[model samples]
Target: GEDITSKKDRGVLKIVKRVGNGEETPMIGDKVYVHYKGKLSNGKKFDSSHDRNEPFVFSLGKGQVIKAWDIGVATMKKGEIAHLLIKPEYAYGSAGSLPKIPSNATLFFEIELLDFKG
Candidate 1:
């Protein structure tokens, strides 16, 4: 119903605390499992893991994902869900990914960390 983002980020990145179960934060190279929904800031759907019925897996802090995701996911605890509001500089940037995204696009992601492995 309400939200409060940290002022330290200057509003460029907003992490909406959704849920948390454990306090262990995944480290670099940790295998992280997640289900996420990605959308444009205006609310048009871009992607989602549940649509394929498979959780996405990736190694953390490895630059395997977008810059926003790299920074955001690294802060998540196991079994936690966070709504991340990210700006273009930390997202697709001015170059954008095209088709599904556009230049200077601001994106939103609801990412859920389901499990992790070292």
Candidate 2:
């Protein structure tokens, strides 16, 4: 378990790499493609791109995703697969994502950066 501190003082997020072989990390506005599984702190799976048999694509630093993703994924290089430990504030926050995630929930994600286009 590799612990990664956010650029700011939100909290420590963990990153355990399963695989990676790339040089550049993404910057703001870069389009990133990924496969990921999101889980609750209890280690229960909640969401997964793998289940859909597709990759998730999004623009970096665009607020199109959660706060934790914006901060955490930006630190990843292409082909990097890592697990992230996200605090409540960086996740859905006090409101939370109902039915699956509870309020003030800490979340986990095993994320693979397939590629990115600047």
Candidate 3:
């Protein structure tokens, strides 16, 4: 359900827009609702919460999602969304997610901030 880029050194992400930032970026322990899509470096599609027609629900820094996602998305506001391109250091790092993501793979994510359950 997700496609991610896994470059050797670095990566890049293009942002469509910022939705909202309830005055502050997300912090640890903040509950957030979001819509997102994952893609590979060659523009291949992988995962998408929008396709399910339901925004994914997550908690910042709670370790439920990927480590990179938890930290990166938590930097957004309650209503602010961002498209991010992350390097392996910020993603799965040397210990990738296995069969799917190889080690040192970069990642691209278009995340939409839907709501804050906190």
Report every candidate's CA lDDT. Answer: 0.79, 0.83, 0.69
If candidate 2 were superposed on the true structure by all CA atoms, what would the RMSD be?
2.0
lDDT of 3 by residue, 15-99 (tens): 5467574776666787878898886545533889977998888778888887658756765666776777776777778987776
Q: How would you encode candidate 2's per-residue C-alpha lDDT over 28-72 as one tens digit per residue?
A: 999999999988889754889989999999999999998878877
Best to worst by lDDT, what's the order? 2, 1, 3
**lDDT tens digits, residues 19-113, model 1?**
77888988889999999999999976578999998999999878888877777777788888888777787778899878888998888888999
Candidate 2 regions with alpha-carbon error over 4 angstroms: 1-12
To one decimal, what is the Cα RMSD in angstroms of model 3 from the true structure? 5.7
The alpha-carbon root-mean-square deviation between model 1 and the true structure, to one decimal in Å, is 3.2
TM-score of 3: 0.73
Q: How much is the lDDT of residue 53 in candidate 1?
A: 89
Q: What TM-score does structure 1 among the candidates reach?
A: 0.85
